[PDB]
Structures are given as C-alpha cells and as structure tokens.
Amino acid sequence: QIVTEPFATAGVEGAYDVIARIGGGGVTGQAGALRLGIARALNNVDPEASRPALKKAGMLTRDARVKERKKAGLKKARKAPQYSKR
Amino acid sequence: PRSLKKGPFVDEHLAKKVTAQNEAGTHNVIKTWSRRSMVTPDMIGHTIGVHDGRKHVPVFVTESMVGHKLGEFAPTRTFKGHVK
Amino acid sequence: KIRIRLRAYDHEVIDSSARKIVDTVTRTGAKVAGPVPLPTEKNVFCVIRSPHKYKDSREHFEMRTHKRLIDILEPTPKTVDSLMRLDLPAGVDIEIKL
Amino acid sequence: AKTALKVKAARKPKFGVRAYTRCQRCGRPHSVYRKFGLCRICLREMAHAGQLPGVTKSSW
Amino acid sequence: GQKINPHGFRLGVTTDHKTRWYAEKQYAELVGEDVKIREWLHKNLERAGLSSIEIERRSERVTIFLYAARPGIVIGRNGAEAERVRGELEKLTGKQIQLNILEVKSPETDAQLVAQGIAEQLAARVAFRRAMRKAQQSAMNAGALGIRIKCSGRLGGAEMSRSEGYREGRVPLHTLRADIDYGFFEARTTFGRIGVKVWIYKGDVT
Amino acid sequence: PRKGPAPKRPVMVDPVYGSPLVSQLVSKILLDGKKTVAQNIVYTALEGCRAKNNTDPVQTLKRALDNIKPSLEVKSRRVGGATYQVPVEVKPARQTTLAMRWLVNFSRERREKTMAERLMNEILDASNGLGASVKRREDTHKMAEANRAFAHYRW
C-alpha cells in the first residue's frame, strides 16, 4: 500500500507502468524509498495538478529518521546499563 | 585433547629417564616437573615424582594410568573444607 | 594506461598533489583522466580516557586515508621522466603502475 | 614497566608463542595497538599532541 | 581534571600535525623512531628551549625542524653542535637526517617557551606570583589577546599542593576557530615538580 | 512532562480493512517488533470472526471495543495520611487504548492453544457481552461507583 498509494493520491491510477531499481536497507525502508521516488517522479512530471495534493499528503518529504548511533557507556543508542545503587 | 596425528607428547627427558630405568632396572623414583607429559606403556610400573607446585608427589604408574597426563595425579590446590 | 595512486591523510594536500600531477603531465601534452576519488579508509580507535578504573568515559580517534586515482592515457616517455623526477609533499605518497 | 621485563620482551623469546607486545614508548603490557605500537595512554596523549599523522578525534 | 588538550581539540580544524609522513607497513616502527628522536632532543637540548619538533619523511630520509627560541646552543660554534647532534641522530635512527633549526618570532608569545621560562624560574626558586605576573605582562606587551597561566604543586616548597592561576584578556577554550596555543612544562624542584600550563589566545583564524 | 503535551504520532489505517482500529490492534499486539507476525495474527482472528458470524469483522471488533470501553476509572490520591481512589472520567482516546490493552492482555491470558484465535474467541465473547475483558470493565466501573464519593477532588 505504501508504494501503490502515490498513484491513488495522484490523478493517475494503476494504468501507468513503473520500473524500479532498489538497493540497500530492509524491506520496509526499500518500500519507503520507492514510495518517495514515485512521489518525486509524479511531482516532476506534473508539478501543478499533482503537486498540491501529493505534498499535502506528506509524500514529497524524506524523513531523516535513521538509526541513532551507539554511545560509550550505554548498551544501545539510548538504553543504559542497569543502575545499581549499593 | 592433543591431535592424534601429532602423537602423544612425552617431554623428551622423562622419556629418556624412563628408558634408562628400563635398561638398568625398573627400580627407582624418577623426579620430574613434567606435569605436561603423557603417560605411556613404556613407563608402566614405574614411580614418578610429579611436581605439584611445591613438592614432588610420587605416583606409582599402573596399567590404567596410560590415557592420562602426569599432572592429573598431582593435585595443586589443597582445600580440606571451609571452616573445620 | 599508466596508473597513479595517491594516498595521504589530508584531502587538501591530496587535491593539491593531484592538481600538480595533472597540470605537469598536461604541460607535457599527455591527456589524462581526471582525478577520481576512491573511498576513504576509516580506521577507528576507542580508548579509555582515564589511566585507571574509569571505563564509561572514552575517547574515539580516526585515521582517515584519502586516495585518488589518475590515468595517464598518453604514454609520453617525457611525461614518464617528469613523473618520476618531480617532488611531492612528504605527507602524500605516490604509486606508479606502468 | 620494569626495565628487566622491557628488555626480556624486546629479546627473541625461547618459543615463538611466548612473545608479547609491550608499549614501545611506555612499556605497558596491556592495551597495545598493533597499528602503531604504543598503548592506551600513550596513544591518547600522543594523538592529542599531534605526533601521530592521520590520527584525529572522531565525533561522527 | 576534566579539560581537553586545546591542541588535540583543534587538531585538523585549525592546528596541524607535527609529523607528516605516510606509511602502512612500518607505521609502528616509524612512530618508535620518532619517539626516540623527540625524547633524545628534549633530553639533550633543554638549554636551547624547544617550541616544537616537526618530523617529515620522504623515502628512508628524515627531516627534523627544530623550533627553538635560542638556536645558539643548537648550532654551537660554526655549526659544530649542529653537526654533532645530526651525527647522534644518524647513530640513533640509522637514516639520513636533514636537520634545520628555526627561530620563534615571539618567544614571549609562544606558550611552550613561556612555560619553559616559568618552570625555569620556579626551579631557580623565584616567587611564583612574581613569575606568573611577569610572564603575563610580557605576553600582553607582545600583543596576545589573552593569557592564562596555572601552576600546580607544592608551590613555594610547602606541604599542601596548590593550583594558583593568573589570567586576563580573553581565552575562549570552547571556541574551535579560536587560535589558542597551549604549552606545558614541569619545574623540577627539591620538592617534587610543579606543573605549569599556559594558554595564549593568539587571535581568531578561519 | 513539565514542558507540555507531547505531540501524538498519527495513526495509520489498515490497508485491508481500511480502519485505524485494526492498525491500533496490530500495533498493540506487536510483540518483539514483529509487525508481520502481529498482523498475521490479527488478520487470522478477523477472518475467523467473519467465519463464525456473517457480520463484518471490523464491525464486530468495534462492537467488542465499545463493550470493553470504560467510562470512568479511579486513580490513587495522596490527600492526607491515607490514599484515596478518586474516580476520573476517561477521554475517548484513553478509553479506546484501555479497551485495546485489556482485549490483547486477556486474549493472551485465554486458555486456548494459539494466539490468533484466542484473540478471535475473546473478540467474539466481548462483542456478545461476555469474557474477562468485559468482566474487568464492569469491575472497574463498579469500583468507581463504590468510590464515587470523591468526584469533588477532580482538578
């Protein structure tokens, strides 16, 4: 759904072919990247009739949410070792 | 354990001492620090003083010793129990 | 034809050396592929900051090796002599594959 | 470290397996890096003072 | 206790490495010879006053820049001391050493020589307050934008240890674009040794 | 927190049934970070629901949620030297959250073998008006009614 819905929110529908080359990440990350790519393609094809709705749906935006780095003294990015007073 | 294709490890001076004992009479105690060595049939019936860290404890090697190291029979730690 | 590998720790001196090489070979004709940047080697060392009993506070260091590649398409033995005789900064090394 | 220990480590061991590293500036036997010798403290202080080329603080 | 070395903090950003060579199979041994060279030079050239030792290598050839306040000691008479120190350098390393000695334009502004002088005065048993004030005043007469000196130890031969410091002007340690020269020395007294640290804010750099 | 009400992440809708309720249900099951496992469980339960009754599984899930939704619940209060159980009205979002949490927990506590149709059985029982979830809703409402005398402590 996350990759098909750019067409659904655009005027065009499932009568418009697409070819994708996908690299890196996992399945969900690849889905999100493909969704953003299709959204940007529709954007730069028709930046007037599909731009408003396509951007309003929050789809011409790349979320910078990336795995936060591990930190010294902590088990994970933010998880901390079990504090033990005395 | 040690690889089979490398053969048993006898410390190459224990071997020569036990061979000399065999040649000149199997009656003497052979003092050694070679806990590292492998018991072999050629030394069966000998008595070997194996070092245990502070004293050469004597072991009389029998038929069943062969598949063991010399140091297995010379305990290094003394416990005796907690309290008394 | 004719590979030139440049490796150093400072990308400023890497770029300056690559520019000097390319401008030299060109001054001796020899058209040459542009300096292509290879991925930088990135070694990381984590060190306990304190000399004793303080492991939760540490310091991280990196040794970044920057690498550039040059191709000398034109054989040009005059450029061969030039590239073997010119002088480069001490921080950057040169590797010539004939 | 002790001078005798430092010289013993420097000299060729009896058996190859018996060799060890030692901090080449410091004599410290723990936490010695193969890339550049030295040790934990020696690395930290020399990297701060700037005698190790390419080595800088990392804050990625 | 919790402050970073200014030179290490600004390394790569504003200040540069003292050694410039590349080697990936010998790195450790070149580091070792560099350590030997620096230790030998520091141990045998205290009198000259060493700001920095800068080492370069091209191919089995080492080049040593010695930044000294008074290179008169290093050069001796008609370069005799320079030749003898170079010869000791080949004896120590085994490589071709090209040694050149450079002045410091403002020794009263270079922090390392300032720590040198303050520690020398402390060893000669000069009042630490007077020594720090003299160094501070000389630095600002030269034209540094900020001085900070801190002497820690058994100051004045006492029993308890103190951490007496002087500063005026501005020394923004937290600013990376700030050009801050840092020096440190140890005054060897009959009562242990005193650690003297000097920060000098030369100015702002890009 | 002290600063103020933190923003809420928008709730997405289920691609299959087109209802945010099922997405909330899967995100509540969602053990160990296995979204696919959780929604396989949820879809299996909903399909079992539509198998055992002709009505729509999303509608039966909705009916179960209304039957488990609490209206008011008591919270601890530190007035004086003894603790009070002050009844407080529950907002629609909070009560939907409570209904979903109770549904999932009691489905996990049910005796049947597999989680998928443990949850299916619990959903059907709740929609009918029976089960541990509905019992807990009734018990919390009963205890709120018992401690109803402290409705004047609300702030």
Place this chain on the structure above:
RNA sequence: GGUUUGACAUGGAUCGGGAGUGCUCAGAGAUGGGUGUGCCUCUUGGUCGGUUCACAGGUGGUGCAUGGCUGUCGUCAGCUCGUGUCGUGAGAUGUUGGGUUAAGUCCCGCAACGAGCGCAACCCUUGUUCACUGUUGCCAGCACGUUAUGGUGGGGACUCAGUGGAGACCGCCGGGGUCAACUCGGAGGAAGGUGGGGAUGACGUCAAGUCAUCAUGCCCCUUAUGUCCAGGGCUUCACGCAUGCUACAAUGGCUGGUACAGAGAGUGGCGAGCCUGUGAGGGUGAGCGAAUCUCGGAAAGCCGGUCUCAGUUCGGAUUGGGGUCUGCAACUCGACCUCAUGAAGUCGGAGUCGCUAGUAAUCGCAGAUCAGCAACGCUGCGGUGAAUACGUUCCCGGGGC
C-alpha cells in the same frame, strides 16, 4: 633451583682479539661443558671481555608530599572581575525586579556602567540539492558477448564514491506580545522555530582514583624487596552481592525453499574453487596490500511441511565416549566438532532498573586485543520496530529569588 657492576643503561681506566653464534653434551630450565667459525681500520678506531671503579635495578612505601591524566556534582546555568557607588567593616550593587528562553538566552526597567570564563555559534556526522571528476563504482540510449557475468567498446543520464558550493535565518505572511524579546498559526521547502546525533564539561567540590601507564619529593631493599628459570597460582568454594547470557515455549521448536543490509578487516593475513570427512577440519589452492579479491552466510521475515500444550520434538545445564585445531605444551586451565546423557526452569518474594522515536523491544553483522580463547564482555553497524506522556500532587536530583 640459579645469579651478584648484576637481566638492562652511561662513563673512566686495565688486559685483549673476536664478539656473536652453528652442532653436541649435562640439566626441569636457568646455566654450565664441548666442537666448528672466527673483527674492520691501523700501530692508534668500531666491538667485547673481565677486574674493579663509579654505578645500575625495585609493579618496594606514602595518591593525605606531588605533576600528569580521569571520575564526579553536571550539559547542571552558573561562576567571577575592572571601575563606580553604598556601608566603619566583612560585604553589597552589577548578577535584584517584570517578560521570555533549552540557556546569566534575550527584552524592559534599574547606581550601575563594562568585561571574562560558561550558554550559543565556529568543527564532525546525518537529512535536500548543484557543479567537478568516472575506477576498482554506476548502466539510461548504442554495438556484441558461449547460453550466460557492465564481460565488452562506450556513456555523464541515474546511483554511489569525495572535493568545493547552495540551503534555515522566526527570513516571509497573519495574530498575540505597551511595544520588545519572544510566542502562536500559515506558506514555501528535503528540513521550521535548536531538524537528529557526536565532539566540546565554566569557577570549583569530594585530601574522590591512579606512586601499578608514565614522571617524581622523601623513606626503605642492595649475595636481595635486584635479576634469571621450571613448576604452581592469579581459574580454589559451606557461601553473599553485582552485571550479563540462555531460558521457561505455540507471536514457539524442528525442517525444506526463498528475499532485503550497513559498517568494517586482510600478506606469518583474508582465502574462493575443487577433492575428502557426519562435522570441527584436512589436502590442494587461485585471487587480493585490496570500491577490484576474500571474510560473505546477513539473521529476524516470507512460503511449504511438521510438532499439538506434554516439564514437551520446550530448555541445554551436567556427565560418559570418540575427535579437530592452535601452540614447545591444552592435567591443573583453551575453543570447537560429534555420539550419548537431558538437570533446574511453569514467568520469578520484599524490592528494583532502562527507555519519550527510528527510541524501547528484538534480529543478526563487524572490529580492537589476539597463536588460540573461556567474548554471553566492550566499542560500532544496519534490519524489524512499538506503547505512552492528562499532568506536577507525591518520590529523587538540581536552578532563580
């Protein structure tokens, strides 16, 4: 068990020419005895020898004699100074007050006017984009390729690599805000009010830690507290605490198939391929000093089959057998393979811990040290990916007055 100017430095003398070593012998080894080989200049050096002479050596003491480095309160919002002024004086004012901010961040007023260290910014990384370059990277259009592999000529489009730029500033619009700082909403935009994370830790506190990394004052040892060696110990076990790992199963176990990573390492190294073995492995052995070659398989997941709630086809402790590899050597005291064995454990008392988003939870991967490894540790890396925050009443820590 050996040794005594010593295991190692530096300097004077003094007798020297070998030092240093190969093979052997004795020895647990240290070491000692053989045997072979035996300086380059030069008539006075490099190198060693003793005898000494100086002297070395100490992980021996004191962290409450110290330097250095570090923890810590605490990323807390503060701590001070010059001059003026007030007060006999310590001292105060600035630095109080109103508003605001993540912030002593700013704004307003003000016997204060200023400045400094902290805050912020400059730095690194991540999110958008442009120019430049195009291999070892990439393949849209063009020509073949053994069928096949961007394998090929070639291409600057896309991706990426890495250099240099652009971009965010409450800058614009509207409201609030006496105004003013700020604040709310909106547009544009990849990103909006500090966008996320790191580096960075003020004046000082705790005579906090470290004399054992190093350095050092004083004291102490000097045929021993130096130093060499073999064996042992640091791995003990009636117990107690602490940090973790694997679990107690069905959101699971087993089994076959099948997808999608990132960041890293490598020449005594990473090792493909083939052969051999149940396997650890062994034998051969290309390739790669590496965007090329190798580590390499990602695992969770999906799909098919199966187990059917059983102390189990859960769990994998323990114990018996047979092995592999590293190493001079796996008894004490290594990892791993295989066969058998199949312990406690049914979700854990009082109490207690972490976390506000790509976080918690979980899933695998890589590196440092390292012959090997007790690593489930540590430092990183990506995959999947939540619930909730009404609120400050209460608990703990802190800030202004």
